[PDB]
Amino acid sequence: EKYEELFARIKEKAKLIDEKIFELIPEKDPRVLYEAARHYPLAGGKRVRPFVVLTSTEAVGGDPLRAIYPAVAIELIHNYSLVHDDIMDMDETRRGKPTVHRIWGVNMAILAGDLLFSKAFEAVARAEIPPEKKARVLEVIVKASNELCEGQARDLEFEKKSTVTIEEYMEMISGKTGALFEASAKVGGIIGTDNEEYIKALSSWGRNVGIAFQIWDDVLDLIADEKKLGKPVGSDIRKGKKTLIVAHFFENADEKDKQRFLKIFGKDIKSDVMEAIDLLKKYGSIDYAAEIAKDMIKKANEALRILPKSKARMDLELLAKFIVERE
Amino acid sequence: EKYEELFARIKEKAKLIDEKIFELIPEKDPRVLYEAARHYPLAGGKRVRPFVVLTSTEAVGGDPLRAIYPAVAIELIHNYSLVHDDIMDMDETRRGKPTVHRIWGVNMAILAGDLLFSKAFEAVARAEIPPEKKARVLEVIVKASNELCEGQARDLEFEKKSTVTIEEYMEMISGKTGALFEASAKVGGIIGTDNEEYIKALSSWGRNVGIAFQIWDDVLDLIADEKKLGKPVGSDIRKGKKTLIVAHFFENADEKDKQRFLKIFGKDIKSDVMEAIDLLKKYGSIDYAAEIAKDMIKKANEALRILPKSKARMDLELLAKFIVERE
Numbered sequence: 035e036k037y038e039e040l041f042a043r044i045k046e047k048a049k050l051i052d053e054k055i056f057e058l059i060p061e062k063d064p065r066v067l068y069e070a071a072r073h074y075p076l077a078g079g080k081r082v083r084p085f086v087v088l089t090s091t092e093a094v095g096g097d098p099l100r101a102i103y104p105a106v107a108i109e110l111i112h113n114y115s116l117v118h119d120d121i122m123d124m125d126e127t128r129r130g131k132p133t134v135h136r137i138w139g140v141n142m143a144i145l146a147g148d149l150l151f152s153k154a155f156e157a158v159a160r161a162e163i164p165p166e167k168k169a170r171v172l173e174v175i176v177k178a179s180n181e182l183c184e185g186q187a188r189d190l191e192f193e194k195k196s197t198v199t200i201e202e203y204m205e206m207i208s209g210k211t212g213a214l215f216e217a218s219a220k221v222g223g224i225i226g227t228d229n230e231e232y233i234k235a236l237s238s239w240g241r242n243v244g245i246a247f248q249i250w251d252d253v254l255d256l257i258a259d260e261k262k263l264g265k266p267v268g269s270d271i272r273k274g275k276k277t278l279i280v281a282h283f284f285e286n287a288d289e290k291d292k293q294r295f296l297k298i299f300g301k302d303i304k305s306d307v308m309e310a311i312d313l314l315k316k317y318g319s320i321d322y323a324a325e326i327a328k329d330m331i332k333k334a335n336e337a338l339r340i341l342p343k344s345k346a347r348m349d350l351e352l353l354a355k356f357i358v359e360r361e
Numbered sequence: 362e363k364y365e366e367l368f369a370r371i372k373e374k375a376k377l378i379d380e381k382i383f384e385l386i387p388e389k390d391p392r393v394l395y396e397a398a399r400h401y402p403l404a405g406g407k408r409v410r411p412f413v414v415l416t417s418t419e420a421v422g423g424d425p426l427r428a429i430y431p432a433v434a435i436e437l438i439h440n441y442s443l444v445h446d447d448i449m450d451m452d453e454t455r456r457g458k459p460t461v462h463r464i465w466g467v468n469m470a471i472l473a474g475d476l477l478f479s480k481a482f483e484a485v486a487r488a489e490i491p492p493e494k495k496a497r498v499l500e501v502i503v504k505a506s507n508e509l510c511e512g513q514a515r516d517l518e519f520e521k522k523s524t525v526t527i528e529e530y531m532e533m534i535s536g537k538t539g540a541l542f543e544a545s546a547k548v549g550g551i552i553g554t555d556n557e558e559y560i561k562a563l564s565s566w567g568r569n570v571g572i573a574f575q576i577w578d579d580v581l582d583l584i585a586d587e588k589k590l591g592k593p594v595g596s597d598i599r600k601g602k603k604t605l606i607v608a609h610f611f612e613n614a615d616e617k618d619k620q621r622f623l624k625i626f627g628k629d630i631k632s633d634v635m636e637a638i639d640l641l642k643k644y645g646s647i648d649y650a651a652e653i654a655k656d657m658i659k660k661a662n663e664a665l666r667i668l669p670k671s672k673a674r675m676d677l678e679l680l681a682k683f684i685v686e687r688e
């Protein structure tokens with residue numbers, strides 16, 4: 035129920051963020067480029083990352099209003115990563131619509147991603163903050179940007195091989211999703227506080243939430259009911275996607291199981307999909323990943339303890355808790 | 362001969378620029394990503410853009426040394442555009458080597474371009490300049506970045522059609538190549554001078570040189586001797602590339618000629634290539650573009666008149682003059 039109100043707040047902030055986003059990427063020449071760029075932002079994303087920005091600036095000092103363009107920067111960066119990643123992953127349809135590359139082609143999709151990335155920094159420039167703050171915000175966003183490319187690169191290398199280790203996958207996801215999430219919180223703080231203890235606490239919360247997010251999604255993809263998930267379980271198995279669940283299984287399973295799993299991994303199909311999920315349960319792999327996600331969530335909030343009590347800290351605690359309780 | 366010394370200077374500055382470039386993109390994890398990113402920079406580009414930066418800061422105030430990272434930013438941006446553009450243009454081999462996408466694949470090439478773009482801004486952040494200057498440099502680079510994507514987008518749309526107008530092609534090239542060149546000079550000034558008259562003069566010189574560069578290359582591609590060009594003339598004709606020469610021809614040629622040119626445009630071949638170049642000469646199209654390039658060169662230098670006499674202004678005048686006299 036409170037989640038309903040939390041989403042009420044989240045959706046409330048989204049409005050401010052959205053006006054800024056679309057004033058940066060309006061319908062102008064060239065349109066094909068700007069509509070291609072506008073496609074994902076227009077899908078009506080919930081703007082969780084920007085929300086973490088503005089909400090983080092309130093858990094430390096106040097006036098998230100000054101963290102609007104920097105929050106926009108982060109949402110623009112997130113969107114550009116989706117466009118390019120969809121090209122690489124060969125993703126057919128984001129949301130209930132075709133992906134940017136399928137509609138406008140790979141070349142225009144690359145350019146749209148580029149435009150989106152470029153405008154994240156134009157958003158960073160438009161920020162209204164002290165030179166020292168600005169300089170420190172630009173540098174947080176840049177380092178997260180680099181980690182993001184590095185995490186996606188390691189993710190591409192995985193394709194060159196059948197198995198991965200828990201350590202390999204965690205180093206990859208940390209930069210793919212964790213980095214930008216951490217940057218969201220860390221940038222929120224910086225904009226409203228000079229308390230290095232808060233920032234270190236906000237950063238740790240973003241890092242952990244960003245990672246647990248994805249891990250929980252991978253978990254849901256296997257054991258979430260189809261009807262509700264809108265689709266059958268195990269599409270990540272059919273995809274041969276490297277998740278923490280699959281890494282745990284490869285680390286713990288005997289040769290016989292490993293080899294059978296690999297036959298029916300990333301290759302009627304109802305039987306093979308289930309036989310694969312059964313192989314994973316045999317070794318507690320799904321449950322394992324579920325626990326890791328919950329622990330990171332606990333550690334994240336238990337790190338916000340350091341900040342004062344406000345409804346802003348409240349939302350950050352609720353969000354983190356929601357991100358791991360949902361189906 | 363003086364060109365030999367100019368290139369001696371250019372190559373002299375390249376050293377400083379190169380150390381900074383490779384400290385930003387060193388051989389680190391992940392390597393496949395960082396070598397893919399290092400591939401074009403390692404080709405030993407002459408760093409003309411960065412040279413314009415440091416040289417421009419000397420034509421106004423002095424101490425180009427403080428314009429090193431901002432110059433690096435621009436060279437990193439130029440390099441990322443080459444990687445992505447090569448993917449789009451289906452370019453087989455830059456220089457005497459394979460392109461990034463052919464060696465590492467399209468996905469890793471996209472990521473390499475992304476990393477290169479991200480590190481341009483990490484270079485911008487590392488700059489050692491007053492907050493006001495920094496903020497104004499970041500904003501010049503961002504707007505040129507946006508123009509660059511816009512110019513490349515319009516260039517992609519051209520493929521959707523057989524003919525283009527002189528106006529269409531100039532609006533496209535202006536952002537593709539002109540913008541970044543203008544930014545190179547404009548950013549040089551800003552770093553060393555608060556004279557808005559210099560900056561407007563430097564900017565105008567960069568814009569014009571950047572555009573004339575490309576126009577002269579297209580001219581050479583047709584009428585430059587093969588032996589010397591290292592290859593036969595008219596590969597742009599076989600490519601069906603939209604240049605100012607082709608735009609002038611489509612604007613001036615009669616229907617009969619238009620239609621024949623289109624048959625043998627972007628499609629033994631020695632005869633068709635020559636028949637196409639002959640069609641262009643009939644209407645003065647090649648000569649036309651040559652003159653436009655020379656005029657822009659004259660206008661560019663005649664705009665540097667405003668700055669004091671130094672050897673820095675000297676090099677900027679020589680470079681502009683070289684860019685249009687070479688073969």
Ligand SMILES: [Br-]
Pocket residue numbers: 314315316317318319320321322
């Ligand atoms: Br399990």
Ligand SMILES: [Br-]
Pocket residue numbers: 641642643644645646647648649
């Ligand atoms: Br001619």
Ligand SMILES: [Hg+2]
Pocket residue numbers: 115182183184186472475476
């Ligand atoms: Hg990336």
Ligand SMILES: [Hg+2]
Pocket residue numbers: 145148149442509510511513
């Ligand atoms: Hg671009």
